[PDB]
Ligand binder design. Structure first.
Ligand code: HEM
Ligand code: HEM
Lengths: 119, 115
């Protein structure tokens, strides 16, 4: 259905990680590039909340960042690009470069974060 | 699906090309970076999006990557000078990726402003 097209294999085989979340903050997408950055397999991330991929010191503040952007609207205005400290499964930390993007589809709101290594 | 709307409404520009270096996709983020509308770019060759001083050399670099077979693209790692329609120049950052789709080879260049 989607794998037979061109847009799914673009994000799936991208050099950058790709973490899509639906309106309920559930990770519906997690390509192999994001598996190497976070150290998580696809089975451990899909279906679960977004806060598992957030560092533990940033867990208190992150649910309030997402909630505010959902109530805002702003005639749709993607987001931003900056460097953030990613926390892996094993507890180690690497610096990265995120590129967050709001994406409306079928009256709902999603978020795709394109990540790469910045060390 | 949610995959077309994701790249269409991405803050980063998105320039997909097919086997014959023809631009199949050009989202509104890439419209602002290059000064070209998507109507002007779709169907035509990649040549226009390449700077004029790099026009002759660039087609050989793409052809060499196709014959190699390698999955990961190691080129275009550091900052590069994009050339707009009007002739002015801005600095950017490219994240190039080989995409095996539809039994052919593609290339998606995700771009941003690194000014
Ligand atoms: C390495 C893991 C991540 C870290 C450390 C992180 C960090 C942050 C920080 C610090 C902010 C506050 C805005 C700012 O930076 O000034 C933020 C905002 C936000 N994040 Fe993340 N983030 C991570 C992953 C993600 C992912 C995967 C998503 C969803 C795909 C996401 C969705 C959002 C959203 C929707 C906002 C609100 C944007 C705004 O209005 O400022 N985050 N994040
Ligand atoms: C701003 C416009 C662009 C500039 C200035 C540019 C510049 C360059 C340069 C100088 C090289 C050779 C040096 C190197 O690999 O580091 C190169 C390689 C390459 N470029 Fe571009 N490029 C541009 C746009 C694109 C686009 C839109 C695509 C396709 C989506 C593309 C695909 C490739 C490929 C496949 C290679 C070969 C890399 C390798 O052999 O690993 N380029 N580019």
């Amino acid at each position: 259905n989607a794998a037979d097209g061109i847009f799914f294999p673009a994000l799936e085989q991208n050099m950058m990680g790709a973490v899509l979340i639906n309106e309920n903050d559930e990770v519906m997408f997690f390509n192999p590039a994001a598996e190497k950055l976070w150290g998580y397999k696809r089975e451990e991330v899909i279906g679960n909340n977004i806060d598992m991929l957030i560092p533990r010191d940033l867990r208190p503040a992150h649910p309030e960042y997402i909630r505010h952007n959902r109530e805002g609207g702003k005639a749709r205005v993607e987001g931003m690009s900056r460097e953030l400290q990613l926390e892996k499964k094993d507890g180690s930390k690497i610096w990265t470069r995120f590129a967050l993007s709001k994406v409306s589809a079928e009256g709902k709101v999603y978020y795709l974060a394109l990540v790469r290594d910045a060390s």
